[PDB]
């Protein structure tokens, strides 16, 4: 089967091995490569590895699929498909016992703690170089644990000789055999014949009594190891650790083939197995004959080294070659390939129903359609077409269907037309930044070989039409297509998840056409008459009795909040034509319809009536303004651009002023730099006085049209600067000098010629200078922004919110922030969309504004802003009580729709993307400060807090640092240590408060942490990043960011863990286990006097000993209840960095594909843990449906199917 969860790991016994192995490898060679024939019983052995190709043996007796179930006589091979080769094992049976490397390279080697030996000492006993007492018996004076090498056997034996009675007079029936060994066999027998439960209880007793620091510390580490072993009852007994027999890998993952040059491409692991096997063979040859003990020692130690190297080499000092050293690649390193293997291509993939081609602008399609060349559509949808030909009945074979769909002869495309109509397609950008780079669409046939795409969607892709080569995908499963046309489809995706801005603000040409329609000219066709609104206006325009545009008076209906006034407005056909389309819930539109106003209107209509409505509005305004812009026939000409006559005057005039300031500096009274300053000032003055007169003259020539004037003023494209160049001086340009200089100081003489007249050679040279300077600057800035983007996108990854309410009637006191000169961030967006706490009323009496637990609305928000209320209490994703998530009502507005966030949707990755992407514009700011604040690093510029309160009184000064205590009505004068080179915000007679910073620089998380709480530290850093992102002119609502900080408050440090390591400074998110489990789960049975029934391993019977000799040696526990302490689990929350916070995640696949597989697999296989797969990243890797979206509800909710 394949459906799985709830996976467990353990260590198996040698006996279960060879069940899946078809035989031992008895021929040490790898493969007969000089004949290219398979090697029997070799590293490439068909007999043990099954068929080497589908339905064949190594001798070629069988070579075809017809041989189902037959067996080759020569080789023990099933003659079936090649697949079965990838599962069966073989084995290598090692002659000498061998000790496992992985235990040894562990810092807490479980053998080391259990037996209690010096590391190198046990290394020696394994490596045969020394002996050690293993089972002495009645040994004269040497204990079981002495360290000793030579001549002890001589003395003990020649003193002891008594009789041969204990099975060679040794301590299996009878002691008096002082016996010693070297490593593997001794530890084997010791572990297999030892018990530790009484050891555990005496560890309890000594931890009650013995030496506190060293003895208790190390022996409680030992206690961890032993009770982790004992915690298993399908027990992982240490007996299994011996690697007596090691299975062998199929050649299927270790291919071999002769390439050019007489060389075969084979895995280094194959060579390693070859070497290990051949050294085992030399062990056989040098031991089976009665060789001296030295030969046996050398061979056995060499074999131990060989197998250790095979399983994980390079641990000992490796060969160094400066250019690129190539040691033999290992098996473990191909297991622990985090970014070599397990990161990019483990997830990045090929795809099989995709296509790729170039895109072109669509001026006819709707917002939910796309143009699709005939062959791409003829090919992606091919299987569906194949079925529909099948259901035709005209075809019976998919081969014939392929024959007819490939050559594409004069038969029906009707099926492509149909299927294309309800089977949307996913359009896919290459460098997807935030989700609005992936959408679905309804596809549509067009002519040619290009992808037609609607003009107003590309801004979501943030692309240009240079010729890019967008990708397309086909879902193939109806659940997927439903998700597509229900959530993916573009019409529903009109908002910016970053913040409430609209995404599809229309472009230059539509805004130009709309600006064209709605001007106001005084006297034209049909001035001053009367209408009824629609009918009379459309008639009088449609018969040329009035032009498109003339001030007319008309009788129209608009709502006064929000009713129903119908008056005589003065307006123009045109504005009437468009306002035929503004929905009948806002009233009537009377302004010159720029870009600013267009965004205002689209916002108001969305906020008043919702998504589908505002979509239809935007589509139709597109179409009409776009046609009108065309029929107006707008173009550009030289006569359009009038240079001002006075420019020839004005440019001249400044010269004489320049002349004087020349002669002034000629007489030298004026400094050179201030000469520079004065001349640049004068030339800037003349630049401005030319530019403004230019623009006004541009306006007034028709007031109805000047291609440049309307292209500028309507905000289609352009600026005052560009147009000034097109008709006035180029301005000033910088003297950069490009190297070792700031640039800065600029040329004394401006580039006075404008692009109209042409440029002299030198000026054009200076322009090339500056322009390529700017291009180089842009290139380097893009390079700089790339690293910020990649890292800060790699900040975070996490799990979802999970409850409909969070009960925590203890929310934040939210107010508006003003930074010491004015207000820069409003409460309006700070309050908007966030559930409220207590019903609020206006100071004007008797007007309930909100009901508790209601979605605050924009109208309500405006009313509140108008009201003289100062702050309000609302919930914070922080204060959520609900563990393993956040409550629905905790968070608030969805920001993608405009609704309350609903159950089941992942907020975290959204917050990540939205907070990372503006980094590309992010230009101390930048990556440094951001990562400094996330990753809990010291500011290196030591700012601290006052941590107490009082009224400031200046003490002694001038030490190079300032020992100052403010004051304390409490009674303290503890002295702080801010160095003098640190700016201080402290002034005499002021009243400081506890936790108040006193010095410049960033406050360490510890100060505010300890003296103010996680809420305080989180709000501090939220404010800080919001400040910087605001200073870089990018708007982000704090919610996203506030999610991230939550993950970093989750950690505690435990100071008094009486019943665990006392150093498990674990995550306070795992705060439940702190007292609930209490090693005994709340001391429910910490008692022996009545009954415990678990510690009955003591001689417990009523017998005046369950009732008078109360139960055991310590009458109850003789000092305190079983612990020598009450067992508090005292702890204090401590902040951490995002990187480490990720590192301390609790899951074995999660960490294993994160960092250091060895440590985590060690701890896990030690603990024998089971994992139920109930994680996001974990289940991503396992290739099942993730525990979000689906995986909260409809993870249940599956019967009926």
């Amino acid at each position: 089967k394949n459906n799985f969860s709830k996976i467990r790991i353990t260590l198996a016994s040698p006996e279960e091995i060879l069940e899946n192995s078809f035989g031992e490898v008895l021929k040490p060679e790898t493969i007969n490569y000089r004949t290219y024939k398979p090697e029997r019983d070799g590293l490439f052995c068909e007999r043990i590895f099954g068929p080497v190709k589908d339905f064949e043996c190594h001798c070629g007796k069988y070579k075809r699929i017809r041989y189902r179930g037959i067996v080759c006589d020569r080789c023990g091979v099933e003659v079936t498909e090649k697949k079965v080769r990838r599962e069966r094992m073989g084995h290598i049976h090692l002659v000498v016992p061998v000790a496992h490397i992985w235990y040894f390279r562990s810092l807490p080697n479980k053998i080391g703690y259990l037996l209690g030996l010096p590391t190198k000492k046990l290394d020696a006993i394994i490596y045969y170089e020394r002996y050690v007492v293993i089972q002495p018996g009645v040994a004269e004076g040497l204990s079981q644990l002495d360290l000793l090498s030579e001549e002890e056997y001589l003395d003990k034996l020649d003193e002891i000789e008594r009789t041969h009675k204990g099975n060679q007079n040794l301590e299996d029936t009878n002691p008096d055999k002082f016996i010693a060994k070297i490593g593997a066999e001794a530890i084997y027998d010791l572990l297999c014949r030892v018990d530790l439960d009484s050891i555990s209880y005496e560890l309890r007793d000594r931890a009650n009594t013995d030496g506190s620091q060293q003895r208790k510390t190390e022996a409680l580490k030992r206690l961890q190891v032993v009770e982790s072993f004992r915690a298993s009852k399908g027990v992982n007994r240490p007996e299994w650790m011996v690697m007596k027999v090691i299975p062998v890998i199929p050649p299927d993952l270790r291919p071999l083939v002769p390439l050019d040059g007489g060389r075969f491409a084979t895995s280094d692991l194959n060579d390693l197995y070859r070497r290990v096997i051949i050294r085992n063979n030399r062990l056989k040859r040098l031991i089976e004959i009665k060789a001296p003990e030295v030969i046996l020692r050398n061979e056995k130690r060499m074999l131990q080294e060989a197998v250790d190297s095979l399983f994980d080499n390079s641990r000992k000092s490796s060969a160094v070659k400066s250019d690129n050293n190539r040691p033999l690649k290992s098996l473990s390193d191909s297991l622990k390939g985090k970014q070599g293997r397990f990161r990019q291509n483990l997830l990045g993939k090929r795809v099989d129903y995709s296509a790729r081609s170039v895109i072109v602008v669509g001026p006819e399609l709707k917002m939910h359609e796309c143009g699709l060349p005939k062959d791409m559509a003829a090919e992606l949808y091919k299987p569906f077409i194949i079925r529909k030909l099948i259901e035709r009945g005209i075809v019976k074979t998919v081969k014939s269907a392929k024959k007819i769909v490939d050559r594409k002869e004069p038969v029906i495309w009707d099926i492509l037309e149909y299927v294309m109509k309800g089977h949307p397609v996913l359009l896919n950008r290459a460098p997807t930044l935030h989700r609005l780079g992936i959408q679905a669409f309804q596809p549509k046939l067009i002519e040619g070989k290009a992808i037609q795409l609607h003009p107003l969607s590309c801004t979501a892709f943030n692309a240009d039409f240079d010729g890019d080569q967008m990708a397309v995908h086909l879902p193939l499963s109806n659940e997927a297509i439903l998700e597509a046309q229900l959530l993916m489809l573009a019409s529903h995706n009109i908002l910016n998840p970053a913040n409430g801005a609209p995404i599809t603000v229309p472009s230059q040409d539509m805004v130009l056409g709309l600006y064209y329609i709605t001007k106001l000219r005084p006297n034209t066709k049909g001035h001053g008459l009367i209408f009824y609104g629609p009918e009379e206006a459309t008639i009088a325009y449609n018969e040329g009795k009035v032009d498109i545009h003339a001030p007319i008076k008309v009788y129209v209906e608009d709502y006064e909040n929000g009713e129903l006034v119908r008056r005589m407005v003065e307006t123009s056909v045109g504005r009437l034509m468009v306002n035929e389309y503004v929905p009948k819930k806002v009233g009537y539109v009377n302004e010159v319809l720029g870009k600013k106003a267009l965004r205002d209107i689209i916002g108001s209509v969305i906020k008043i009536c919702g998504v589908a409505t505002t979509a239809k509005f935007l589509d139709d305004i597109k179409n009409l303004g776009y046609y009108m812009a065309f029929k107006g026939g707008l173009s550009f000409n030289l006569a359009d651009v009038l240079i001002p006559d006075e420019k020839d005057q004005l440019i001249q005039e400044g010269y004489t002023a320049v002349e004087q300031i020349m002669q002034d500096y000629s007489m030298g009274f004026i400094t050179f730099n201030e000469r520079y300053n004065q001349i640049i000032d004068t030339w800037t003055h003349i630049n401005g006085r030319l530019s403004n007169v230019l623009i006004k003259q541009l306006s007034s020539d028709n007031d109805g049209f000047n291609s440049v004037f309307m292209m500028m003023d309507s905000g289609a494209r352009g600026s005052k600067e560009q147009i000034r160049q097109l008709s006035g001086m180029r301005g000033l340009m910088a003297k950069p000098q490009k190297s070792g200089a700031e640039g800065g100081q600029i040329i004394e003489n401006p580039i006075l010629s404008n692009f109209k007249e042409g440029l002299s050679v030198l000026e054009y040279f200076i322009s090339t200078h500056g322009a390529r300077k700017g291009l180089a600057d842009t290139a380097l800035k893009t390079a700089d922004a790339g690293y910020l983007t990649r890292r800060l996108v790699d900040v975070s990854h996490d799990v979802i919110i999970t409850e409909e309410d969070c009960g925590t009637l203890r929310g934040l006191l939210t107010t508006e922030l003003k930074q010491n000169e004015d207000v820069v961030a409003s409460l309006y967006e700070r309050i908007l969309g966030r559930v409220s706490v207590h019903d609020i009323i206006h100071p004007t009496t008797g007007d309930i504004i909100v009901r508790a637990g209601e979605e605050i609305r924009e109208q309500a928000a405006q009313i509140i802003e108008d009201s003289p209320i100062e702050a309000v209490e609302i919930r914070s994703v922080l204060t959520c009580e609900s563990k393993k998530g956040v409550c629905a009502k905790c968070y608030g507005r969805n920001l993608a729709t405009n609704r309350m966030v609903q159950r089941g949707e992942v907020v975290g990755v959204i917050a990540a993307q939205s907070i990372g992407e503006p980094g590309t514009q992010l230009t101390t700011g930048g990556l440094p400060r951001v990562t400094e604040l996330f990753e809990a690093r010291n500011p290196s510029n030591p700012a601290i807090v006052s941590e107490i309160d009082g009224e400031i009184g200046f003490g002694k000064l001038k030490r190079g640092n300032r020992e100052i205590t403010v004051t304390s009505k409490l009674g303290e004068e503890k002295k702080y240590l801010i160095p003098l080179s640190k700016q201080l915000l402290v002034q005499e007679n002021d009243f400081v408060r506890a936790g108040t910073p006193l010095s410049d620089g960033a406050i360490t998380p510890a100060d505010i942490l300890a003296i103010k709480g996680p809420t305080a530290v989180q709000e501090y850093i939220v404010n800080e990043v919001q400040d910087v992102y605001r200073l870089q002119g990018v708007k982000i609502n704090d919610k996203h960011f506030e999610v991230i900080v939550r993950q970093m408050m989750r950690k505690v440090e435990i100071v008094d863990p009486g019943d665990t390591l006392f150093l498990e400074q674990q995550v306070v998110d795992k705060f439940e286990v702190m007292e609930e489990n209490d090693r005994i789960w709340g001391k429910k049975v910490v008692i022996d006097a009545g009954d415990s029934q678990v510690l009955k391993a003591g001689q417990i019977v009523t017998a005046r000993k369950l009732r008078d000799e109360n139960s055991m040696l310590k009458r109850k526990d003789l000092k305190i209840v079983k612990v020598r302490d009450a067992k508090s689990a005292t702890a204090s929350q401590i902040l951490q960095g995002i990187t480490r916070a990720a590192l301390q995640t609790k899951s074995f696949m999660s960490a294993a594909s994160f960092q250091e597989t060895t440590k985590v697999l060690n701890e896990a296989a030690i603990c024998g843990k089971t994992d139920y797969l109930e994680g996001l990243k974990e289940n991503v890797i396992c290739g099942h449906l993730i525990p979000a979206g689906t995986g909260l509800r409809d993870y249940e909710k599956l019967v009926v199917m």
Partner: protein
């Protein structure tokens, strides 16, 4: 270039591309995160299981779509089969629970 079904590699059950042989596009990490951001129910699962890297599953799904059963039966990718095989177990304790 485009492709629906094509020749299969001999080192992995992934069909390569490049218009030398059609193949497909790199379904990279970032669109994995995008289908993460919204609730990809079967989109992401079929992308990483049957759309790619399951020649057996791909053949079955193809034959089903042409044979009239659009309901898939996604199983376990070889990447996890490789995971059990390459971890190498030891004395082997994989799970059946």
């Amino acid at each position: 270039h485009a492709r629906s079904i094509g020749p299969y590699s001999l080192i992995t059950q992934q069909p390569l591309g490049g218009k030398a042989q059609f193949g497909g596009q790199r379904f990279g990490e970032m669109e994995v995160w995008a289908l993460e951001a919204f609730g990809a129910s079967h989109i992401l699962q079929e992308i990483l299981t049957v759309k790619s890297d399951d020649v057996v599953g791909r053949s079955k799904a193809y034959e089903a779509i042409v044979k009239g059963d659009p309901m898939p039966t996604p199983g376990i990718p070889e990447s996890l089969n490789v995971l059990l095989h390459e971890l190498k177990g030891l004395g082997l304790s994989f799970s059946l629970d």
